[PDB]
Structures are given as C-alpha cells and as structure tokens.
Amino acid sequence: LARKGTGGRSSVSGIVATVFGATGFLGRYLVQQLAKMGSQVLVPFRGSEDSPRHLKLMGDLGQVVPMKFDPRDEDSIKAVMAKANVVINLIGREYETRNFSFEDANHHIAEKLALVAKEHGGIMRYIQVSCLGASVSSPSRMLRAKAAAEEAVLNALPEATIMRPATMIGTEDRILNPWSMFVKKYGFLPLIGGGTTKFQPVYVVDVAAAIVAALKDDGSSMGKTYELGGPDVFTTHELAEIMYDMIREWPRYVKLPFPIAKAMAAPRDFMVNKVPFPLPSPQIFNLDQINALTTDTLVSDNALKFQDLDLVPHKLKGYPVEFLIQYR
C-alpha cells in the first residue's frame, strides 16, 4: 500500500491490520509478519490484558496496538476496526465452551466481523481464516460452522480472501503439543482411528506467510478461497513418527477405534449443562476433532495452494518442528 520504508520494524506498509485472533497460536506468527514487514496491527484481545503482551514487542512503538473488545458486542468491534484497512479474522475454537457455542465462536462471529467491516467502508482486504476441509456436511461441528463462516463472509463481503489452513504445527500449537505431554503418559500415544487419517499439516510460519502474502498481492487473491495445505501429505501415525524423532522417546502407539474415542470424549461434551463450572479445554480427546479425524478430507484438492502465492511451505522435519526439543 502506501509503503514508505525499506524493510520493516520501522517501515510503513499502509496495512493497519486488526488481526481478530492475534492472541492465539496462529496470531503470534501473523502479527509478527505484519509488524516485521513494518505495518500497524490493531490486535484486539478478549479478556486478560496479559493475552496480547507477547505482541507489544515484535512491533515498533505503536505498530502493534492491543485493544479490548467484547466478541458479542458490536460498537466495540466497530471501534477496533475504526482506523483499519486490513481485517484478518483468526477467531475460532476447536472446543465448545459453556458461554460461546461452536456457531457463536466460528460462524456467528466471522459473519459479524464481516458485516461490521462492510459497514466500515474502507476495509480493502478482509482475510477470513477457517480450517481446510471445512465444508458443509463435514462431521465436526467446528468445520460445518467454519464452512458457514466462509459462506457468510463471502456473501456479506465479496472479494474477501479465505485461507483454508490445515492443522497447523509449530510451537504452542494444538496438534503436537497435546501429543507430547501425553507421551509423558509413558510413551503412550493414543492415535485415534488407527492413523488412517490423511491430513496435510503446515508450519504455522508458512500459514502466516501466506496470510500476509495475500495482503501484499495485487487485486487478485480476493474472494479466492485458498487451501494452505503444506507439503508431505501425512497420516496421523506418520506425523507422530516425526515427533518421536525430536523428543527422545520410543514409539509406543496404540490404536483406538472411533466408538472407543467418542465414548472417551463423551464427557466434556456436557459443556452447556455444567453451568457452574467451566471444563478444562479438551486437548487430545475432542469429540468434534475426532469427527473431523474420521474422514480424511483434510487434503488439498485442485483448489488454490501455496503455489498461487509465489510461496512454497517449509517441511515438517527439522526446524519447523524443533519446538519439540523442549520435551526431551
């Protein structure tokens, strides 16, 4: 955009972004890309002010302005998107919480940010982030919601990019860090469904590099739902094989039939019932993540891949997984 600089960390890029999901595992890499290529980031946080503290750095003195906002209350989303031209949406959950349901956290928000950005005429690029294979009739209610979110962000706001990152790996992720700390149940890894799932993980740095690459691009990458798949189409068991290469442990997997898992994840699905107590965020056994685990639709079809962003993803061996060394 109106870029006046050389690199970043003091440059300008005319991108005063509001990364709605910045205080999150994908958010810290995307905010660092947007604010290391020298552009403002209006990180909106939901609760504790300690959430975006790790984002006050990685941006030079107001290039990252953490702001407070209530997800269900507008006139605050409009205040966060007051001075903005890019609005990325990383607000998503893999687990239903007693207060915010799957739609009220994946679909009824993305549609709401879409509408309140449409109203705030001036949002040049609105990126919408949803999981890969999030198409309607997918088992996991998280993916059906995330599909409705795409359909409502494109309808209510055309020329709005839609990344489709598959399960993203990296430090502080929700895919590998639960498996480790469950290998700390004495090497016991419960790969569910027998590892027949075929899903294409991707180094979160490269998902961020794609989310920024659709901003730095021209008028293209508007309304075109990418699929940030990644290389080396894996299987859950095979991906676990690479963890045990980093964390020094001996592969001691077990297979779990899907009924056994869905029964093991039958608790923590009474979230709307147990009102006077919030449940502890089901990490590995998530009935909805399991419904997604069943069908191996998490593979990039002939839709737009990283190749349509002049970008090639990193592998999943070596550094893009070296966050596991802290578990040795």
Binding site: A2, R3, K4, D218
Partner: protein, 693 residues
Amino acid sequence: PTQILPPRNPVGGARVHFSNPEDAIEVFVDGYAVKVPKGFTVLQACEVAGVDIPRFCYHSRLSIAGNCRMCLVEVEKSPKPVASCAMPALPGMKIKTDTPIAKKAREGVMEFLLMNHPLDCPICDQGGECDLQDQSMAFGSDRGRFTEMKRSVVDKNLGPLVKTVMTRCIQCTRCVRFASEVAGVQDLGILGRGSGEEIGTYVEKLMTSELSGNVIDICPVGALTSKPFAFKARNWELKATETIDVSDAVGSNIRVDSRGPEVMRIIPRLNEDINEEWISDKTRFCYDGLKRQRLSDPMIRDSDGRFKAVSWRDALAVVGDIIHQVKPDEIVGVAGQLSDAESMMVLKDFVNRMGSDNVWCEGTAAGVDADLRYSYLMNTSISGLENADLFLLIGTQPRVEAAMVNARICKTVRASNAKVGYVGPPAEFNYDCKHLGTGPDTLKEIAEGRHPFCTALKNAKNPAIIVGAGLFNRTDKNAILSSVESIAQANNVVRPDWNGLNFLLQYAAQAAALDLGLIQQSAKALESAKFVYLMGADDVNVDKIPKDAFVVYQGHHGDKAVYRANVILPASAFTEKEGTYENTEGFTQQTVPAVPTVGDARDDWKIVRALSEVSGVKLPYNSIEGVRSRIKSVAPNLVHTDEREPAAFGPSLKPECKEAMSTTPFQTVVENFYMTNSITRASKIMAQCSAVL
C-alpha cells in the same frame, strides 16, 4: 633547526589570479612572506597567507567598505590599526594579524557591535550560522560592559521573501551595497545617521527585484532572513547536499539544506563559473514546491473519469498495452523542462525503438537546429561575459530568464563600463540597457550595418551577443539566427580567442535535450498522435494534443497536463534524484540526491526504462551508470560532469538564410519568472510573490 612549518595555503583554496607574474607584491603576513598581485587589499594579502581576518561588511563580490572595523590588522609602520579590507598591500608591508593591538582592536569593535545589538540570538533565524556570534565566540571579548538601554529599530516590510528585524542589523551596509550593485535595483538605503541608522526602503517598498533573496546570505547578521524559511529549522539540523538547480537553465549551484525527508532551505554555494554566490529567488524559494501537490502514486483512469491509485505493475501494464495498440509514428515523447539527461536519453531510446522519432523537450519549438553545439549554448562562459565589451541581448530578457546570466551581465556592466544593446520587447533592466528596437526589423538594421549601434559593435574589442532561445518559437527562427550570425561575422564577434556569440536557454533540460538531439522535427506530431508521453512537461500546450491520445503524464507535480493524462506515473523531483544536467554555457553539473522520493515515486529514467521493458522493447542498460554510458555514446558532453566542453565550431558551417519577419516583434518568452515550471507553480511562496510582480 629543521622545523616543519605548516603549508600556509590560501584561506579557502582561493585561486589567486595574477594579472601577470611580474607585479606580484610581496607582503609579510605575521612574518611569513606571501606574493600577492598588485592591488590586493591587506585582507586579501592575508587570505593568500591562510590567515582568516574577521570581516563583517567586506564581501569579495561586493564593493569595499569601512562600515565597521572588525578586521583592524596592525601593519608595521602605521600609527593606527589599518582596516585590512581597504588598505592596499604595498610591497614590503608587514601585516601582524595577531599582535595585541590587532586583537584588542577586534575585541573593541566586537563589543561595539554587541552593544546596541538586541539579545535576539535564540529567536534569530540565523542563530547558529551567524558571523556576529562566531566572531564574538572567537575573536570578540567573553564579556560585555554595556549595561544601558540598547537602541531598537522597527521591522521594515521588505516583501514575502526577506523577513527583516533591523534591530539585530549592525548597519555594516553590505545589503544596501548588494542591492545597488549586484542586484542593481537600488531600493535598500542607510536612512539616517548615528546609531539611529536604519537599513531598508524609506517608503514601504517590497524588494521587487529578483536576485534580492541572496541579501540573506550577504547579511552577516540575522536581521535580513528568509521569510519562507521563517523559523522552520536551525543551522545545525540541516543536512546539506551540494545539489544543483533546475528552475532556470543557468544551472546555478545550490545547497539543498534538508532536515530528514523534506527540503527546509535551499541556499547557494560558491561556484565562480556559473553563479558566484548568488541564486535567483526562483531557486531559493522553489523548495516549497517539492512538498506540495506531489504525485505519489501511479493513477490510471477508471471507467468514470477520476483517477485510481493503482500500483506500478498495473499502470505500466496499461501504458505498455496502449503503446502496443497504436501506430508507431503516432507516439510522441514530449520531455519535461526539468528532466535530466539520463531520463531524456532513456525517453529517446524508448520512443525510438518503438518506431517513432517524435521525442522533444518541452520548450524547443519546431525545427530547432541542434546539430552544432554553438547553436544552443552560451559559448562564452557565464564567466566569459565579464570580459565582454558590448552586449546585444536579442530579446532574451535575461533578467527574467537565466537570472544569473543577467547577474554576470550587471556585474560586468558595473565593473568594466560595458554598454549593452537590447533588441526585444520593452522590459525593465537592472543596469543601463539602451533599448534598440522591439522587433526583428531593428535586427536587420544591425545586420546591414545601418544602425547607430553597429558602429559600436564593430569597434568593441570583445563583444557579446546574447540571443535567447525564447525566439526559436517564432516561425522565422532560421532567418533570425542568420541575421544574428551575420552580425557576428560582420563585427568579428565570434573570433578564435573570444567566441562572443552565445544563445541562452530558459529550461534546464533544454540544453541537455538539444545535446541529445531531442529535436521536434515538425508539427503533425502532438497532433494526429495517439500516445503523448509527457515526461514531466507541464508547459506543453495540452490544447494541441488530440482528445483521443492517451496522454501519460510522467510528471511529479501536474498542473494542467495531469488533468488530461489518461495515466499518471509519479516521478522524482530534482532534489530526490541524481540527474546529469547541462546549463546554457555548456557546463554539465550533476545533482546529488538530498531528500527521499515522495510516496511511491521513481526516478524519471527508471520509470521510462521500466515502461520500456513492460512494453516489450528490450533496452540494453539497466542502471544509472549504464544509461550514462549510453549518453556517452549519444552525446559525450553530458558525461564529463563539472567540465564545460566548448563547441569548437563557429557559425561558418550553418548553411544559409531566409527573410526575417517584419511583423510579430520579439515576444516575452517568460511572463512570470515566478511560475516558470511545475516546482515553481505548485509552490506556496512563488504564488503570492505575484505581488512582487
């Protein structure tokens, strides 16, 4: 005992000009002999000895004065400290610049100057760059005994350029001499006597003269300061680049004093061969342009009529497509008056390989003769005009266009009593002008020796005949130039050692253009032409271009060409780039980039070469040094920078002549001089200088 004395070279590397190596007077500056030509004041006999004598009113360009006694060196056998500025060095004179009597005299005077002087140093615009502050902090006493009521003076209104605080002014008379002599307008005066002395116009009279903004550099005190540079910066913040100027084709030297990304103040700098230490008020206060109305994003035209600030890929793509889908002979490449040599070379090499030959500078009218380089140069150097005996300014109004050429003409009318003849429109001249005639008829009257001034032009030893390129626009340009060269051959003007024939130009690019052969062959270009490619040309008549022409204005400001432009390409200014310029006398300066380009602007040559590669034509070079090698190919004059390359071919090669038009007398080529180009038109200072007329 085998000592190592310092070299003792002149004060500023000052070239000492012996009129002959025989009359070298030898004087002792602090017991160190120095050989100075006959007539050197003691101050110059010390500036030859490296001794810097503190001077308040002694300017080398200006006359000599005793309005203050800050120098007072003690010569050997005089009863009183002699003012060094006026005492001519006599052979054997012993000058003691640091003897206790000299230092006490300097401290005495610097106490008197700081006695009635107000404590305005914090609020003084020239607080850091002050002769009074730097002479008090170096030669004047550390304390002042005057504790009484200083005198104070009201602030005279001297126009929208020179802010005046006469209380600070020390009445050294330097400006009242500069306006009387160099500027030659005679408006300033030392009204009154005693401490009540007040410098300025007795009646409220804006300094209507151009070239009168240099009084601030002349002024050794804050008193006279740039009102545009009201207080915006300080003498220490300003990072200085030794750039050149492009407003007028004199190509005056300059220091673009910039603070960060913007040009705070444009100040002259010594270059004895173009502008001694003076720059026109068109150059001092055009810096305000470079920050107003700048084009910062490449805007193409949508399906409505308003612009759309697309990126560079899209704008270059649309321009390339529209040149691919047009007939070749319909491409024209009008190049702006501020365009450097490189970008004009790139424009030529682009619109050439596109199958056209319709590139030309903005000012050069149809059928210019750019073959022989004397035909558009000031063959006699701008310094050479100091040796001229008689001038014949054929039109050319040199006070208006090429103001430093007129400054040299006025200096060499005052110093050596030269007499000028003027065949042009009725104008106002600093000096005695002796207007001859209004039209070309009186030019024939001189060509045929039937004029009372032809007998003057004959008898003069070294004559000069300035013919402004403003009369190339007339249809009978060959006839006028033939009569000019007839006057030359008749009065022995252009002779092997003088070459008094010289044409001045009014556009900075015009010399470099006519050097690269950027000639408008004829009309029927810019008409029946469908890819007009204005390269920063605002003064091109956009009423000539056909309505269906896809004008692509690669300017940096845009006044009227931008409104017509079907696609804009924002370029850099003259300070933001590094462009090789050629002034009228053939001197080839080279600007040095001061401030960063605004927004998403690019270099002129970069834009044209990128448009070339987008539009398919593979152009050999890809850098600034490459295109300078291409210039060396097409015109090596514009590669040997900072060196004038005289044209070794007189007018005896121009083929033949025609008849000069009786009607249509010489027309004023520059109407304003305060709005001559785009930088100057979009400025907030030049506009409002319209009151200065």
